[PDB]
A paper describes a structure:
A bacterial [name] was originally identified as one of three putative halogenases encoded in the biosynthetic gene cluster of pyoluteorin, an antifungal compound containing a dichloropyrrole moiety. Recently, [name] was elegantly demonstrated to catalyze mono- and dichlorination of phloroglucinol, yielding, instead of a biosynthetic intermediate, a compound that serves as a potent transcriptional regulator of the pyolyteorin biosynthesis, whereas another halogenase, PltA, which acted on a peptidyl carrier protein loaded pyrrole, was shown to generate dichloropyrrole. Herein, we report the wide substrate profile and the unusually large halide versatility of [name] and its crystal structures that reveal a unique recycling mechanism of FAD. In addition to its remarkable halide versatility and a very broad substrate profile for a phenolic halogenase, [name] is at most ~15% identical in sequence to other structurally characterized FAD-dependent halogenases, and it contains a unique C-terminal region (residues 390–502).
The nearest carbon atom of compound 1 that can be halogenated is ~4.5 Å away from the Nε of Lys87, further supporting the model. The phenyl ring of compound 1 is stacked nearly orthogonally against Phe90. The hydroxyl groups of bound 1 are within hydrogen bonding distances from the side chains of Lys501, Asn405, Glu49, Ser404 and the main chain nitrogen of Phe90 and one hydroxyl is bridged to a carbonyl oxygen of Ile499 by a water molecule. The substrate binding site is situated relatively close to the protein surface, which could allow access to larger substrates, like resveratrol.
Author numbering: 2 to 501
The structure:
């Protein structure tokens, strides 16, 4: 065995995984069929992924990882093109055959700013961290075959000798090449069935210029400085600027749109489908009067999948290779960084004791498969809440209250790790959470609210209930549980901009 671990994929997941393991004294080999620089999506950072990056940084003593958690540190250390800013998520509702109202808006702001990750620059910087810590990288290779045995892993490569290792990690946000070989990938059982078109554009107007200024919306933040979601019956469109930072030099804006395939199936080329969508929703079209594509539109007819298994004796699929649901709420990155945090110490224990059995990595699988299941519920119920604004206003508080509890929990673990400096206590605290993969992590009150809310949403879809009743049902449930949530005034429905 030439190496200890082989990592497929050299984007942010595999790069950070290689960084922490190489730092810890393993001989890592990162493999990739693509080569840097390259384009990538999964751009919206969240407070959770912010804390999880700072946790990775502190747990393994790699300060450069912490730089990726804050837009000012990104600009300073990665580069001035490497991110835009975000002061919150924001959602603006629309319907076919009616003018869009700037009062049909929700946008809960952040205290601490976050990044819109320009992934080509962030991913390359991440690989840099890995390379500087001893990990070998090989780009632009083709994997003929992967063989899993009792004594190791062997990877065959085109125009090169095969490479042997103790363990293999699949960190490809790609078509899960190892999961496709193992036959673990499936669409069966997913509530979500969504397609996606996405690209980067130039000369995209801000929300303030194109639809409605700050004086009309009454928002505490510019929507230009937010992860903007345009939502409507059959799906949603994102507007994620990289050109909204005062110190930034990036001119592009990420643009993507998703359809619920149960409601609408696209039939034509992306650019035709794009012009049809803007005719249907003319207010959304005001963003793109002067706009130009800076790259080819990528179409993906089915973005949703899950896996029945993701760990074995001598392999592990990281969440991005295990399953994906939807870019909505940007749960992809959260699941990924948390999985690396759980997996890394166990792979070290395995390598330091030469024990490679499925049993050891079983809590990595539990977290990952739950996170994809919870993310499926969240998104599918959210796609149903798109049908009316008032319903969306009440529903988004379910996501928000959970997300806040998740964040506060990760602050607690970060604060306790910073104080005590005890890596063993942290690993155990993380594994001992009552609801791994779920939004709150360790709150029985919230997971009660989430479960019953999703039951109300899925019942409302099945029986086609009136939106005013469903909204009230959820409003009651929020009032019932509000004492156990944080004191942010979630039940006050007239407040559409929930402060901290
Ligand atoms: C914003 C966004 C992020 C995505 N992230 C991932 C991911 O992390 N992992 C993944 O497997 N698929 C992801 N997908 C879906 C992926 O691009 C499709 O599965 C793609 O079609 C690859 O599968 P295939 O077409 O080769 O079959 C994402 C899609 C979008 C729109
Ligand atoms: O995007 C987010 C906004 C907010 O106010 C809280 C949170 O956890 C996420």
């Amino acid at each position: 065995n030439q190496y200890d671990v082989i990592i497929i994929g050299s984007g942010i997941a595999g790069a950070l995984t290689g960084a922490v393991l190489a730092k810890s004294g393993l001989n890592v080999l990162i493999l990739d069929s693509a080569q840097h620089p390259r384009f990538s999506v999964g751009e919206a950072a969240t407070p959770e992924s912010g804390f999880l990056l700072r946790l990775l940084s502190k747990r393994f003593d790699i300060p450069e990882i912490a730089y990726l958690s804050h837009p000012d540190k990104i600009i300073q250390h990665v580069g001035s093109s490497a991110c835009g800013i975000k002061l919150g998520f924001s959602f603006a509702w629309h319907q076919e055959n009616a003018p869009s109202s700037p009062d049909h808006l929700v946008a809960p702001p952040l205290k601490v700013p976050e990044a819109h990750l320009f992934r080509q620059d962030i991913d390359y910087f991440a690989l840099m961290i890995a390379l500087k810590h001893g990990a070998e990288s090989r780009q632009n290779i083709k994997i003929e075959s992967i063989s899993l045995n009792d004594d190791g892993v062997e990877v065959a490569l085109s125009n090169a000798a095969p490479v042997k290792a103790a363990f293999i990690i699949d960190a490809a946000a790609q078509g899960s090449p190892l999961s496709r070989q193992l036959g673990l990938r499936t669409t069966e059982g997913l509530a979500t069935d969504t397609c996606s078109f996405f690209t980067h554009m130039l000369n995209v107007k801000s929300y303030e210029d194109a639809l409605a200024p700050l004086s009309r919306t009454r928002s505490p933040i510019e929507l230009f400085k937010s992860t903007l979601h345009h939502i409507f019956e059959e799906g949603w469109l994102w507007v994620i600027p990289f050109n909204n930072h005062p110190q930034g030099t990036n001119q592009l804006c990420s643009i993507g749109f998703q359809f619920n395939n149960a409601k609408y199936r696209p039939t034509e080329a992306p650019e035709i489908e794009f012009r049809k969508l803007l005719k249907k929703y003319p207010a959304i079209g005001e963003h793109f009067k002067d706009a130009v594509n800076a790259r080819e539109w990528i179409y993906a007819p089915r973005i949703n999948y899950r896996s029945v298994q993701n760990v074995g004796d001598r392999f592990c699929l990281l969440p991005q290779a295990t399953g994906f649901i939807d870019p909505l709420f940007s749960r992809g990155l959260i699941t990924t960084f948390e999985s690396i945090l759980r997996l890394a110490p166990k792979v070290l224990d395995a390598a330091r004791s030469n024990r490679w059995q499925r049993e050891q990595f079983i809590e990595v699988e539990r977290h990952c498969l739950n996170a994809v299941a919870t993310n499926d519920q969240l998104v599918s119920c959210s796609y149903e809440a798109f049908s009316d604004f008032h319903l969306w206003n009440v529903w988004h508080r379910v996501w928000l209250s959970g997300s806040n509890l998740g964040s506060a929990f990760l602050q607690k673990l970060l604060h306790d790790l910073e104080h005590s400096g005890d890596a063993r206590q942290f690993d155990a605290a993380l594994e001992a959470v009552r609801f791994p993969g779920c939004l709150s992590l360790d709150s029985p009150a919230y997971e009660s609210l989430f479960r019953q809310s999703c039951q109300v949403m899925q019942q409302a879809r099945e029986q086609a209930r009136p939106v005013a009743e469903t909204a009230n049902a959820l409003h009651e449930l929020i009032k019932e549980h509000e004492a156990e949530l944080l004191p942010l005034g979630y039940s006050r429905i007239s407040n559409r901009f929930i402060l901290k």
